[PDB]
Amino acid sequence: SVNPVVLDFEDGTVMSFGEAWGDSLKCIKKVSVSQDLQRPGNKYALRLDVEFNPNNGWDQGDLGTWIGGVVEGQFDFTGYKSVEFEMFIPYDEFSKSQGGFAYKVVINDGWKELGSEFNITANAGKKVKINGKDYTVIHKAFAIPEDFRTKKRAQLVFQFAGQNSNYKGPIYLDNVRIRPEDA
Numbered sequence: 497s498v499n500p501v502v503l504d505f506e507d508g509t510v511m512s513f514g515e516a517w518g519d520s521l522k523c524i525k526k527v528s529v530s531q532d533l534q535r536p537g538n539k540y541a542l543r544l545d546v547e548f549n550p551n552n553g554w555d556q557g558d559l560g561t562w563i564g565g566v567v568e569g570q571f572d573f574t575g576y577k578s579v580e581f582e583m584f585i586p587y588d589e590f591s592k593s594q595g596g597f598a599y600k601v602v603i604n605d606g607w608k609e610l611g612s613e614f615n616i617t618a619n620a621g622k623k624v625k626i627n628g629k630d631y632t633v634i635h636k637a638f639a640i641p642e643d644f645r646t647k648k649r650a651q652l653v654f655q656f657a658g659q660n661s662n663y664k665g666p667i668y669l670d671n672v673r674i675r676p677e678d679a
């Protein structure tokens with residue numbers, strides 16, 4: 497009985513993704529919409545140009561979007577049960593990089609972590625070829641807890657943190673969905 501919120505970038509825009517608060521991007525140096533992953537029925541993705549410093553065990557940056565672009569809006573999560581996303585990292589360059597990275601998916605209403613993973617390296621997830629290039633692909637859904645299935649501050653945050661990584665390159669996000677489907 498609820499309509500999924502589908503952040504697929506298919507309008508050719510960043511769909512309000514950018515800093516979550518002033519100067520939050522940090523290791524994320526640029527946020528843009530890209531056709532690098534263009535393929536049947538999926539023309540655009542969110543490109544995050546990142547730089548991690550290998551001497552830092554937690555080289556953090558925070559990317560936010562407001563649902564509907566409404567800054568400080570609230571969104572009724574009643575009936576929504578998961579947040580799903582796909583993440584893509586060029587395989588060859590990532591494999592050559594040292595260390596790894598962590599990510600978190602958060603609803604920023606008192607900072608509520610939905611899920612996270614640590615020590616991601618190139619052999620995480622699945623290796624997929626898109627436009628002549630291999631990618632590490634992470635595709636997950638995290639639960640929205642029952643106590644958040646109500647009106648909450650409508651900022652979704654993706655945190656990235658280099659963990660002694662020297663990776664300098666893109667990370668892509670696509671198909672970020674707030675879904676009634678269970679995680």
Ligand SMILES: OC[C@H]1O[C@@H](O[C@H]2[C@H](O)[C@H](O)[C@H](O[C@H]3[C@H](O)[C@H](O)[C@H](O[C@H]4[C@H](O)[C@H](O)[C@H](O[C@H]5[C@H](O)[C@H](O)[C@H](O[C@H]6[C@H](O)[C@H](O)[C@@H](O)O[C@@H]6CO)O[C@@H]5CO)O[C@@H]4CO)O[C@@H]3CO)O[C@@H]2CO)[C@@H](O)[C@@H](O)[C@@H]1O
Pocket residue numbers: 517553554600604606607614655
């Ligand atoms: O705009 C309105 C209002 O906003 C205010 O800004 C807010 C902002 O919107 C947001 O809500 C922010 O929330 C904070 C939050 O309160 C809390 O501090 C949170 O901390 C996170 C942090 O971001 C990281 O995710 C951190 O990760 C740790 C890992 O979980 C793990 O423990 C890790 O372990 C490492 C270890 O460090 C070491 O390398 C080794 O031992 O290996 C381990 C890994 O195996 O360490 C990580 C780093 O600590 O987790 C913590 C939670 O525990 O961060 C968010 C985001 O900043 O709050 C602000 C307010 O402060 C204001 O601007 C206000 O004026 C505005 O009106």
Ligand SMILES: [Ca+2]
Pocket residue numbers: 504505506538539540541670671
């Ligand atoms: Ca897309």
